[PDB]
Write a protein that binds this DNA or RNA. Structure first.
Lengths: 92, 78, 99, 107, 105, 91, 99, 82
DNA sequence: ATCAATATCCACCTGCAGATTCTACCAAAAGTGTATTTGGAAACTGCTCCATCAAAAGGCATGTTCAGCGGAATTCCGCTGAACATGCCTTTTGATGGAGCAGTTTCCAAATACACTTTTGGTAGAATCTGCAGGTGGATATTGAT
DNA sequence: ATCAATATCCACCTGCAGATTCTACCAAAAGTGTATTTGGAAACTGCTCCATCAAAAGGCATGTTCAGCGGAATTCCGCTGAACATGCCTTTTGATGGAGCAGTTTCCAAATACACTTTTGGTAGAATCTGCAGGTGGATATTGAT
């Protein structure tokens, strides 16, 4: 059974280097990631259907992130993702 | 434009809702709500418009947004 | 001759009237304007299918008519008959639309 | 042979995500962009909530973040609060909040 | 002969099946699912039209219009629960005035 | 495409002398498409929970039980189970 | 002569107390039974992972706590401080649980 | 035999819940009304939870069963497998 | 109870907007047929964790008494909705150029599908590590009686 | 306001469960590298239907007046909340047989993947048909004034 734990723990260390996390909380965190994960892929999924497109791209992903997340969160979310895409693209 | 939504009109809605006596300060309280509703819904419809590379919000664009809002509407797709 | 109707006789009459019809109760032109105005703040120079505006209104009025239903209930719960803002306020809060 | 995560400048697992996208059957195909973008969004979000939780832990003089901290962080931020307005964080409790009219005296 | 008939149905079993796979719901789609589902779409349909046709009659009307569908739905506990978050354009509302609001007889 | 014709057919078995307005048919179409999406989605999820690759009538049934109110559900199950039976017994 | 706290002085302390913790407020065993009773009078011969019984409890109190807040507001709306069934009922009606 | 377990939710217990809910004063009738409300909640979730269980042809209601049934009813629980 | 003014129905009437019947065209469906593949049931079974009996100790639920206070009933009165006839300014209706929303074609960047090789993140299980829970005492409020 | 009774605060204290930390096997992931396929952007276009506009339509803004609604104020009353005694049922800690979830190999009924073929449902342009919406009228129920 996979889990986003080690990655949560990494991100955790970056923001608050000396703070730990109980297992119960890491579970709540794993639940959080999977929750949002499905939610976005869902909006992405339908969006694609509504347009008779068979592939989910960074463009659907992005629209979903906009439909899904509130003001400030969405704004910043797009950046990070665009950022990553750009860096992933310009690297090969 | 917001005041374009008139007292008589608002009064009518309220009566369809079974409201018998209406306070004066309700008309402005009403408009505000109606505004947040449209904002919340149009915002999502327009997003559908743009994702589709269009310049015209379509009835389906609104249908889709409303569903996401949990305000499923029958009669324009559904 | 001096003839008048008592407060409410006209109301209840209006209630029965509108609860029977299904027509939209807001004037379309003013509505459509407010719609576009709101829209323009999200994306410039847009167009609307005659039908998109119709859905929006149909959805709008519907939402309201129902919110007035919960408000009258809130007004009544407080042993009143005049719906006030705090009644709308309370309904939207329990609806999860506020806090 | 770097990983796509590193190649994207990420901490979350780009490959894993692109993988789940397939097994979740959301569309016939999934372009290489989606997973990169989605892992980023996922990562960004966990950071935002961990930042906020981490402070709550600190505020309550604790070192290890526990569910309550997660809860305090979410209910205190307008946005994470909306993003999760229908999520129940177990063992989180509620935010201390007493209605005015319930307090004593007069002034 | 069409699957609809083999299943003795008025609805399009072939179409339903088509929509199921093309809808990305699963990797594969058994042969009966679309039959079953079509069977279930048909029945729910008949149910509404039934109650809806009755409303028409109870109005001295022979053609079913939106109102007749709205009335038929919010009057049936179950259907009403199912469409509990659906707006029927041009449906209006059920006639109802709070007791406490009726004239003081 | 649209379920309209099938709707109209079903309508006639029920109320043979009753007709329907376009706006009503449109609503009926919206109704069919809705339910279709809701039942399908549940089934889809169901399969995933059990790590299954196929959506069978098994799923459609459970889905239905989860989606429709008791009585409504009961009949819907019946109608459905009947079709599969009828269908399976034929060439 | 002996010290005596006025009504509501303890209540506030309890609100402050309980609002400060996160422990489940219902006897664990009695809850497991109720769960098993209900489950059983729906399908016999069923078993429960301890975590399932806990997820239900977590869900259930989370629900009740939130429902009590709505109730509290509804009462306050009526200019009272003592919540009553009618308050719970108004809340559930607006919430869409018995509308 | 299991019976009247709903009375297992004591007056003390219901009171603590209302306290966390910020309620100061409580009507004597609140307790039974509440038991009723709780019962309908538990009924609704268990049913779906158990529908999921039978479908999986299992005899043990799992924590996921409960988490799936809760999401179905829009009461998503983080902490028990999602 | 008695008019007087309206509001409200019921029955009949008809023009036309929108439902309907008729037809030829046909591309996307839907069905039939053949060959190949595979999801997942079946069966043997290791092994997790569930139901359960055991028992002791105290944290708590139960039940009583009693007074304090909150809610309901009532009277009072200032204030604001609402009914109403008045008079035009905004909405509605049917007519018209033209802007995009869709239909068709082209063809390449990008996504399968598949063979191998390499990196790793779950993990059985060891042993060591460490925040904080739960206990204690004393300094600091917060209450309530006077 | 002064003081007595109580609760909240809180920093120190340390056994200890739950968390950090390996050593390592590794089936599964993830990554590398052709070979093959194609989904959908991009450019060009016909044609709806949408933004615009003048004209005939018709609902809203407006000031008066007063009925009546809602809150402030004053009560008896009863039911809720502290406080307290008593003692039961839950919680705690284990051990335990074994039900049944879950892993692995076995394998065919059923689903997939074109291919060839026959039907059918949507689109279109014409013509013909008809449920019912408003309009009229005259009867009567409703409401309000006395």
């Amino acid at each position: 059974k996979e889990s986003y734990a080690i990655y949560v723990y990494k991100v955790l260390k970056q923001v608050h280097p000396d703070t730990g996390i109980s297992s119960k909380a890491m579970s709540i965190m794993n639940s959080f990631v999977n929750d949002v994960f499905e939610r976005i892929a869902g909006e992405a999924s339908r969006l694609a259907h509504y347009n008779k497109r068979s592939t989910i791209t960074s463009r659907e992903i992005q629209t979903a992130v906009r439909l899904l997340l509130p003001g400030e969160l969405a704004k910043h979310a797009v950046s990070e993702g665009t950022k990553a895409v750009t860096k992933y693209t310009s690297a090969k | 434009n917001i005041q374009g939504i008139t007292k008589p009109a608002i009064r009518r809605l309220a009566r369809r809702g079974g409201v018998k006596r209406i306070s004066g300060l309700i008309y402005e309280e009403t408009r505000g709500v109606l505004k947040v509703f449209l904002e919340n819904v149009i915002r999502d419809a327009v997003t559908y418009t743009e994702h589709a590379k269009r310049k015209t919000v379509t009835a389906m664009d609104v249908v889709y947004a409303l569903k996401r809002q949990g305000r499923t509407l029958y009669g324009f797709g559904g | 001759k001096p003839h008048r109707y008592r407060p409410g006789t006209v109301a209840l009459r209006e209630i029965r009237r509108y609860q029977k019809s299904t027509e939209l109760l807001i004037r379309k032109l003013p509505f459509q304007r407010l719609v576009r105005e709101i829209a323009q703040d999200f994306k410039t120079d847009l167009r609307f299918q005659s039908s998109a505006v119709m859905a929006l209104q149909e959805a709008s009025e519907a939402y309201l008519v129902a919110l007035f239903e919960d408000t009258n209930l809130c007004a009544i719960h407080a042993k009143r008959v005049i719906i006030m803002p705090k009644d709308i306020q309370l309904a939207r809060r329990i609806r999860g639309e506020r806090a | 042979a770097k990983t796509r995560s590193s190649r994207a400048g990420l901490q979350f697992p780009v490959g894993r995500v692109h993988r789940l996208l397939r097994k979740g059957n959301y569309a016939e195909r999934v372009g290489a962009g989606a997973p990169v973008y989605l892992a980023a969004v996922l990562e960004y979000l966990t950071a935002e909530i961990l930042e906020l939780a981490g402070n709550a832990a600190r505020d309550n003089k604790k070192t290890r973040i526990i569910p309550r901290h997660l809860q305090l962080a979410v209910r205190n931020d307008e946005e994470l609060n909306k993003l999760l307005g229908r999520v129940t964080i177990a063992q989180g409790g509620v935010l201390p909040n007493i209605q005015s009219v319930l307090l004593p005296k007069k002034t």
